[PDB]
């Protein structure tokens, strides 16, 4: 059952012990494997048609319970006995239960710890929680996201945090952003199926818009959100202009770079997935840190479903975009990523190459080892998306699964 | 909807379900608990050498598998001569304990692994493949021969040419055909008194029984290794290839200069010897098999792997980078040269290459060829993206589905 596990780059091997603890499938099995598909259909987090089973839900939330106490070292002690038995009065009289604030804190951080796809993990600890359950409208909501920016921005000097909204209940609607960030560009279907902007926001530039949005005709206008308290239609709010940190791109050395026009916001601010936490399920709790520069700079401006720019870089600077083999397409990569960089270094705006991010999750994953005999992690996601082989990480085999508390996706609301 | 595992290209917003992988029956390291899909060698396709001939029902439900392969692939499904084809297969196992393919089966098993093989980004080839018989052998000195027609063949004055070549199967109370050698040209390594490795370091222990076994060891970066060859219950005998069957290319840069100064060359033939080939339960332990190379393999897997030729530091100091420091991309740009003077340099000398953006997108055919075909492709995701430039080619954004096909190349303990 426990796999042996090898680094082929210093020919050391491990054997990962935590895995026995997941409880919850994957999408594998011994037939056929499923580790590259990205969205599940079962990993999913489905709607309260009633409240979960009591027998499932006490038998996560014990488990969390154990954790926790285990986590403060006062296992046993009666202060532990003492919750495990407030916890199932309440499952027992209400099918549901609550968290205390510094159940929560800790359980916030364990989800990112257990992160599979998360290679920034070695900041785990370092996470500032801000509970925000005492929230009951849209316009509260609003508030509790500027502040969330404000200090996560800090100026430039990034610092990680999540925002927990109310929890989900039975027989009655979620909290949700509507937003997969908290910061995104609009994609304008302009007249001939082409994009204006980011392709990949093209349904929420809509529904924005739907919303009474007044839309911009940029390539790079900051979306409004839209917020949604239980039952009730999304509220539209544009963000404080001021609020929204962005760093204009530039090459060190390469002048026409910067006649391009690009620019990417500072504050990478998941918004649209659910955090679950001893069984409870929290539809709204957006989290940021700091951006890993290929994300930006392959990704996001290379993909081709996205920004797609290698070609016009390619012809700035002057390469034979005509055939494959002459690497015009990994030559452009190179100095797109270079130009994030130093952008962001110029700019006084936290971020971390890839190289020096990878070291780190090998880091973490020798501290974790020692620590919990393993380490949750989705090679395919951990390694950049340029220069994979590059890295560290590219060399070590790892091993996927789900441990609880987790960061799950869930369906759009609309 | 479907019942099967549903796939989704992300660059195109297209969606296919594999029903392909309901034909597996054999399983992979994988379970609903935890996902093993990156191991490199899972102890499963992996086959632990049995002493003796298959349990008779395993071995004739894999040939008939097999044998109903055949007949469908050639459209004779349920044919008179395909329920004698099953009953000479049952009878041959009840009187021997084994059984022997015909040469248009073996010709069928052979595509078909490499077909069936997830990790290979470059099955779109898999119909043009020459099968060499070699089914006759009957010493190390006849392989030899047999090896050294197959590298002519397949080398072709740089105009390479797909081909295995296959040796007798395993038998019944009879030792194993092996080519020791994991690929048929392979550079020596060679442990430094101070403990640096002159060579490939990933071929040390294949260099010690070369010398171990006979051979007068050379000391340079990219000495040709010999081949030790193993017949039946016989110990390994040692081969030199001749040079001039050997095809390499010196390496250069297009725009750098002082790059050709390095010295570094590659060999054109990638030939990998040490995997076993099983069609229908027979197990062919010496089958030796070559295309022709991606240049990432080259440029990026043999020499910049850091537990390989390790250049990227060396070429990144002679283009006067910033070495000290991750954020300069030293690595990156390095790896990017590195590359282009393999494609530049194959080009040049006229040895067949392909780089890594069309090897994917041609892949990409293979994989629609294949929907229609088949209804899915086994793919293994973390292979078949190349080790540099991930995602700027189509094979990121599309999902994949690994599963085990049979017949099948797999991994077998070395022969020592
Ligand atoms: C501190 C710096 C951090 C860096 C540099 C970083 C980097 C990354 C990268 C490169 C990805 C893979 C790409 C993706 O899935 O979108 C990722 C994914 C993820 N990260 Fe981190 N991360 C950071 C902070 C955070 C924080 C603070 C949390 C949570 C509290 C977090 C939770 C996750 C999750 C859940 C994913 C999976 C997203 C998905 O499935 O779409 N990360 N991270
Ligand atoms: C025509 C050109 C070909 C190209 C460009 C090519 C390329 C590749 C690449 C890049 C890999 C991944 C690296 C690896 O797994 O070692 C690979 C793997 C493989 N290829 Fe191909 N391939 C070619 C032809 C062949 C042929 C002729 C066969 C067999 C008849 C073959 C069978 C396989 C197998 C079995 C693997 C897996 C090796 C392993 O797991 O160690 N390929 N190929
Ligand atoms: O840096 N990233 O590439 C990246 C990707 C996905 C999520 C996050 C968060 Br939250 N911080 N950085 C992230
Ligand atoms: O070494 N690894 O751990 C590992 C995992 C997944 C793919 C590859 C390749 Br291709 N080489 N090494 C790999
Ligand atoms: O090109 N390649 O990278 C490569 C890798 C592994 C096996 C083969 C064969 Br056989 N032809 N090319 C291959
Ligand atoms: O698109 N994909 O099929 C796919 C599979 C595995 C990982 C990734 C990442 Br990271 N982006 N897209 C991916
Ligand atoms: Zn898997």
């Not at 499932?56 to 006062?74: E, G, H, M, P, V």
């Not at 994009?195 to 839309?215: F, K, M, Y």
């Not at 397409?329 to 270094?345: G, M, R, T, Y």
């Not at 936290?350 to 005999?373: P, Y």
């Given at each position: 059952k426990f796999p042996r596990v090898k680094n082929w780059e210093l020919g050391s091997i491990t054997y990962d012990?935590?895995?026995?603890?997941?409880?919850q499938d994957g999408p594998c099995t011994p037939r056929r494997?499923?580790?590259?598909?990205?969205?599940?259909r079962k990993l999913q987090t489905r709607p309260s048609p009633?409240?979960?089973?009591a027998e499932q839900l006490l038998s996560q939330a014990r488990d969390f319970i154990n954790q926790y106490y285990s986590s403060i070292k006062r296992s046993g002690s009666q202060a532990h006995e003492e919750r495990l038995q407030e916890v199932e009065a309440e499952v027992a009289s209400t099918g549901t239960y609550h968290l205390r604030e510094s159940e929560l804190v800790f359980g916030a951080k364990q989800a990112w710890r257990n992160?599979?796809?998360?290679?920034?993990?070695?900041?785990?600890?370092?996470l500032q929680v801000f509970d925000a359950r005492d929230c009951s409208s849209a316009q509260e909501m609003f508030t509790y996201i500027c502040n969330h920016i404000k200090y996560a921005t800090n100026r430039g000097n990034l610092r990680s945090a999540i925002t927990v909204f109310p929890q989900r209940a039975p027989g009655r609607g979620d909290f949700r952003?509507?937003?997969?960030?908290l910061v995104r560009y609009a994609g304008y279907r302009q007249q001939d199926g082409s994009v204006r902007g980011?392709?990949?926001?093209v349904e929420i530039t809509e529904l924005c818009i739907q919303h009474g949005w007044t839309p911009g005709?940029?390539?790079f206008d900051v979306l409004p959100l839209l917020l949604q308290a239980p039952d009730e239609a999304p509220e539209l709010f544009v963000l404080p202009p001021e609020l929204v940190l962005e760093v204009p791109l530039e090459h060190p050395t390469l002048?026409?770079?910067?006649?391009?026009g690009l620019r990417w916001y500072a504050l990478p601010a998941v918004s649209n997935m659910l955090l679950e936490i001893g069984g409870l399920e929290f539809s709204a709790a957006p989290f940021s840190g700091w951006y890993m520069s290929t994300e930006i700079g392959?990704?996001?401006?290379?993909?081709p479903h996205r920004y797609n720019i290698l070609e016009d870089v390619a012809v700035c600077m002057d390469l034979?975009?005509?055939?494959?083999?002459?690497?015009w397409k990994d030559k452009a990569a190179v100095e797109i990523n270079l130009a994030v960089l130093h952008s962001f270094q110029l700019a006084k705006v936290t971020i971390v190459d890839h190289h020096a991010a990878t070291v780190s999750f090998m880091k973490h994953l020798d501290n974790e080892q020692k620590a919990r005999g393993g380490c949750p992690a989705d090679w395919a996601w951990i390694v950049?998306?340029?220069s994979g082989s590059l890295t560290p990480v590219f060399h070590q085999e790892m091993v996927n699964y789900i441990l609880s508390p987790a960061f799950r996706y869930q369906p759009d609301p609309w």
């Amino acid at each position: 059952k426990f796999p042996r596990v090898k680094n082929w780059e210093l020919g050391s091997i491990t054997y990962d012990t935590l895995c026995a603890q997941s409880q919850q499938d994957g999408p594998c099995t011994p037939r056929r494997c499923l580790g590259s598909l990205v969205l599940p259909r079962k990993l999913q987090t489905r709607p309260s048609p009633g409240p979960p089973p009591a027998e499932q839900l006490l038998s996560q939330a014990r488990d969390f319970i154990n954790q926790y106490y285990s986590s403060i070292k006062r296992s046993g002690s009666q202060a532990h006995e003492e919750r495990l038995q407030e916890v199932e009065a309440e499952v027992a009289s209400t099918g549901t239960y609550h968290l205390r604030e510094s159940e929560l804190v800790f359980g916030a951080k364990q989800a990112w710890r257990n992160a599979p796809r998360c290679v920034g993990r070695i900041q785990w600890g370092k996470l500032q929680v801000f509970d925000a359950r005492d929230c009951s409208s849209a316009q509260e909501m609003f508030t509790y996201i500027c502040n969330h920016i404000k200090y996560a921005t800090n100026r430039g000097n990034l610092r990680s945090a999540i925002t927990v909204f109310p929890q989900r209940a039975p027989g009655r609607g979620d909290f949700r952003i509507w937003n997969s960030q908290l910061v995104r560009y609009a994609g304008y279907r302009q007249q001939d199926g082409s994009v204006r902007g980011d392709p990949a926001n093209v349904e929420i530039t809509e529904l924005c818009i739907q919303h009474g949005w007044t839309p911009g005709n940029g390539r790079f206008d900051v979306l409004p959100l839209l917020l949604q308290a239980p039952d009730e239609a999304p509220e539209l709010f544009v963000l404080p202009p001021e609020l929204v940190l962005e760093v204009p791109l530039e090459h060190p050395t390469l002048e026409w770079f910067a006649a391009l026009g690009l620019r990417w916001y500072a504050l990478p601010a998941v918004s649209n997935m659910l955090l679950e936490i001893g069984g409870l399920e929290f539809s709204a709790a957006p989290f940021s840190g700091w951006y890993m520069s290929t994300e930006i700079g392959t990704r996001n401006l290379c993909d081709p479903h996205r920004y797609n720019i290698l070609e016009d870089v390619a012809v700035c600077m002057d390469l034979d975009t005509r055939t494959t083999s002459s690497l015009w397409k990994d030559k452009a990569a190179v100095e797109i990523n270079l130009a994030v960089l130093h952008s962001f270094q110029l700019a006084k705006v936290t971020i971390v190459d890839h190289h020096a991010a990878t070291v780190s999750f090998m880091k973490h994953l020798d501290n974790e080892q020692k620590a919990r005999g393993g380490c949750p992690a989705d090679w395919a996601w951990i390694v950049p998306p340029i220069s994979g082989s590059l890295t560290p990480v590219f060399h070590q085999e790892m091993v996927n699964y789900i441990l609880s508390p987790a960061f799950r996706y869930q369906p759009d609301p609309w």
